[PDB]
């Protein structure tokens, strides 16, 4: 791949986050025969059903709605082996610094707070890890447990919870226990301190001794050891790590010459498919690759955020 606009979670054989491939099909016949009037320009175009229309080229099909889906890109996949789109994840093509480590990384996660704060995938991992260990996830009835923007911005809870698959199998599994553990705690119960167990227990609240009967561990609850009979975000960083913030000038400009005629072209939205405005040229080309348009570019970066 020359360029990846998308990333998915590949349940296997990657069991990890990977660059994904975009696909489209008639939502009536489910064939690869919908021509779109207009290509996608943003995540909504591909995530909201029937938002995008074409003509299904099957002789005897009348469907005009598109249905988009994604696939892992790290290897072959069957015509429809679907991966979940991690739509918060973006290639950092404008070299924006991260809100927490302040390095330039790629890809990044972009919170859907108003400020559209940017965090690298390393810091997102750690953010998630920290917030587990410290029971700092946030509940929401219609979601369960999630995390907001790292900067503390409201209405910024991650809704597509497959974004936590960024934690690797085990951290991820901790994450899935979290509600269940929280239940016990919220009833004055306790978790087994034994590493690898962490099972839920509810003794009488005025007992300092607690036995896991799990893995057998007796422990003192006040201090979580085995049972003794004795006694026991920077402000500038935030401002800078904003998706839509005004930036310097990179290598990759915001005016580029048509590959055929060489007239400078402005790009006026998210779709990577360009059509040269010149009446006497009209080349269709990819904004990024500088080449005639094609199904690879469609697959890999039909649009960019
Ligand atoms: Ba002692
Ligand atoms: Zn894969
Ligand atoms: Zn059809
Ligand atoms: Zn970072
Ligand atoms: Zn934010
Ligand atoms: Zn235990
Ligand atoms: Zn103790
Ligand atoms: Zn041209
Ligand atoms: Zn391209």
Residue numbers in the entry: 141 to 353, 359 to 377, 393 to 465
Give excerpts from the publication:
Parkin is an auto-inhibited ubiquitin E3 ligase activated by dual phosphorylation of its ubiquitin-like (Ubl) domain and ubiquitin by the PINK1 kinase. Parkin is an autoinhibited RBR family E3 ubiquitin ligase consisting of an N-terminal ubiquitin-like (Ubl) domain followed by four Zn2+ binding domains RING0, RING1, in-between-RING (IBR), and RING2. Like other RBR-family E3 ligases, Parkin binds to an E2, and ubiquitin is transferred from E2 onto the catalytic C431 residue (on RING2) of Parkin before ubiquitination of lysines on target substrates. Furthermore, C431 on RING2 is occluded by the RING0 domain of Parkin, which inhibits Parkin activity.
Further, to confirm that untethering does not affect the native interactions between RING2 and RING0 domains, we purified and determined the structure of untethered R0RBR (TEV) Parkin. Co-elution of R0RB (141-382) and RING2 (383-465) fragments on SEC and crystal structure analysis showing intact native interactions between RING2 and RING0 excluded the possibility of an artifact.
